[PDB]
Amino acid sequence: PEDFQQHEQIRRKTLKEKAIPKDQRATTPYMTKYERARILGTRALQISMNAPVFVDLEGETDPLRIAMKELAEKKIPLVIRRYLPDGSFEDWSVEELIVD
Amino acid sequence: MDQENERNISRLWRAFRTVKEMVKDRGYFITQEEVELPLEDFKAKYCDSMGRPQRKMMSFQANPTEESISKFPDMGSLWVEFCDEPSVGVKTMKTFVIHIQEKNFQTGIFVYQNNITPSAMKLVPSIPPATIETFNEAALVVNITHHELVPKHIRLSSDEKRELLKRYRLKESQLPRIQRADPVALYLGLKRGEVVKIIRKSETSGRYASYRICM
Amino acid sequence: YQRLRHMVNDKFQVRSTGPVNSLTMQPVKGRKRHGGIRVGEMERDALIGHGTSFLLQ
Numbered sequence: 325p326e327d328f329q330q331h332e333q334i335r336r337k338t339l340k341e342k343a344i345p346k347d348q349r350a351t352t353p354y355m356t357k358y359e360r361a362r363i364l365g366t367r368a369l370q371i372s373m374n375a376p377v378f379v380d381l382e383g384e385t386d387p388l389r390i391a392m393k394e395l396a397e398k399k400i401p402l403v404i405r406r407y408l409p410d411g412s413f414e415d416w417s418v419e420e421l422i423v424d
Numbered sequence: 425m426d427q428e429n430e431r432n433i434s435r436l437w438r439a440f441r442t443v444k445e446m447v448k449d450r451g452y453f454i455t456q457e458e459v460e461l462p463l464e465d466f467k468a469k470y471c472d473s474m475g476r477p478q479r480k481m482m483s484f485q486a487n488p489t490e491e492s493i494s495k496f497p498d499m500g501s502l503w504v505e506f507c508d509e510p511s512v513g514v515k516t517m518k519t520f521v522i523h524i525q526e527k528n529f530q531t532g533i534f535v536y537q538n539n540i541t542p543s544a545m546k547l548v549p550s551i552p553p554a555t556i557e558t559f560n561e562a563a564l565v566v567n568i569t570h571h572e573l574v575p576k577h578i579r580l581s582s583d584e585k586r587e588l589l590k591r592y593r594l595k596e597s598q599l600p601r602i603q604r605a606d607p608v609a610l611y612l613g614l615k616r617g618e619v620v621k622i623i624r625k626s627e628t629s630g631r632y633a634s635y636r637i638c639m
Numbered sequence: 640y641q642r643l644r645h646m647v648n649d650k651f652q653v654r655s656t657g658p659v660n661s662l663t664m665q666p667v668k669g670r671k672r673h674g675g676i677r678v679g680e681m682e683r684d685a686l687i688g689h690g691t692s693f694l695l696q
Contacts, residue, residue, distance in 0.1 A: 358690055365693065410593035 342412045349414040351406050355421035359404050360395075363418055367391035367400050395423065429475060436477055437466045439564040443504060443535060446611055449569065450579075451492035452502055479506035479535075495581045500530025506561075510537045517544035524554050531613065532556045535564065557613055568607050575624040577608050580635075585619040588635060602636035614638040652676075 344350075355363075368387035371377060378399035381390050394400045398419045406414040441459065448454040471477045486502040493499060503524060509516055517540070524532045536558060548556045568574055580588070589596070602609050602620055614620065615638065622634045650670060657673030659665055666675025686695040 361691075362693075408593055409598075412593060 344408075344412055344414045346415075349416070351414050351416070353420075353422050355404075355418070355423050359421070360423065363400060363402055363404070364388060364391045364395060367394060367402060433467065433471065433475075433477060434463060435565055436479075436561060437463050438566070439535070439561040440466070440470075440482060440506075442564040442567045443533065443559075445567050445569075447486050447502065447504065447533075449611070450502075450613060451489055451496070451499065452486035453489050454486060479508040479537075482506040501528070502531045502533065503527070503529045504533045504535065506535045507537060512536045512540040512544055514541050514543040514547070517541070517547050521547050521551055521556070524556070525551055530554060534558050535561050537561060555613070555615075557610070559610075569611060574608060575622050577612060578621040578623070579612050579614060580619045580621055584621075585617075588619060596637055597639070599635060599637040602638050604638055606638075609638050 365388070368391040371387040371390050377390060377394070378401070379390065379394045379397055381393065384390050384393065391400070395418070400418045402418045404416045404418070404421070406416060408414075441461070444454055444459045444461075448459060467475075470481050483503075483505045486504070488496070488499045488501075505520055505523075507516065512534075517534075520532065520534060523529075530553070532554065534556060537560075540558060545558075548558065569577070588594070596617065599619070602614070604614065604616055606614075609620070612620070618638045620636050620638060622636060624632055624634060626632045652670045652674070654666065654673055654675055657675065658667045660667050668674050668677075683695065
């Protein structure tokens with residue numbers, strides 16, 4: 325009980341130390357080809373597990389095409405945790421990232 | 425009439441050129457006039473009437489430039505020594521080691537002729553914080569940093585290194601390496617930990633800045 | 640014209656979920672045995688190449 329509180333404090337301290345604040349973030353404002361691929365795949369996976377959809381799927385049966393529609397209207401509720409070689413990260417939302 | 429002497433006068437002058445270029449490249453006050461000294465001016469100032477060069481006369485003192493102290497404040501005076509004896513002994517080397525310590529010199533370049541005694545070579549890292557660097561005059565005939573394939577290597581300050589390790593979130597060793605005994609590393613007189621900035625011409629991007637850590 | 644004796648589609652196979660070896664628990668070798676198609680080191684390299692980590696997975 326006492327040894328866990330210290331372990332949790334260290335875990336959350338290291339997390340905060342690695343997190344790059346919204347202002348200090350310096351990566352590409354563009355969503356990488358890889359980011360788009362995973363977002364569309366993961367959101368499709370969520371859609372197939374009866375997750376609340378934020379778009380009107382006009383006769384759409386493919387979850388990926390639904391995930392594609394949600395991306396077009398920037399309604400995908402996901403965040404990209406961009407890691408750097410030291411372990412530090414930049415949290416970028418799907419909404420704010422520029423898509424070609 | 426000159427059998428082989430004429431060739432040796434030019435080879436020694438060319439080695440003296442490279443040493444002056446090296447001393448200037450490190451950040452010591454050496455004028456462009458002294459570097460661009462012709463063979464005829466060398467013969468009149470450093471060679472006798474008989475036509476023989478006196479290497480003990482070639483030795484000189486170098487002080488850091490105003491620009492070098494504002495980047496490296498712990499950079500001290502430098503002493504260059506051209507040994508007139510073809511084979512450097514344990515007794516001749518001992519006199520040079522004491523010469524640095526007494527005059528409060530921070531760095532000492534020793535240009536030897538043919539070879540150095542294995543016993544004398546042990547006296548080189550025997551007097552810290554003062555550093556001793558040995559160079560063969562035959563290897564100094566041509567400057568390696570003047571070669572088209574050797575880019576501009578610039579030694580970075582403890583602050584410049586600190587900044588580079590921050591921008592890329594790097595650890596000293598996590599960087600590309602340059603050996604402590606690498607020809608250019610020996611030229612600039614690199615110590616372990618010192619980061620060198622390499623401006624290399626690419627046939628894709630043109631001028632490109634890369635870096636290497638001396639270990 | 641001459642008709643060559645070979646029937647080129649002799650190695651024609653399809654596997655969804657067939658038998659596996661006890662040690663590796665991986666699809667067993669053998670077209671007629673409902674065996675698996677090997678994804679070798681070069682195909683592994685190609686899937687790393689596209690940066691397509693879920694296809695490799």
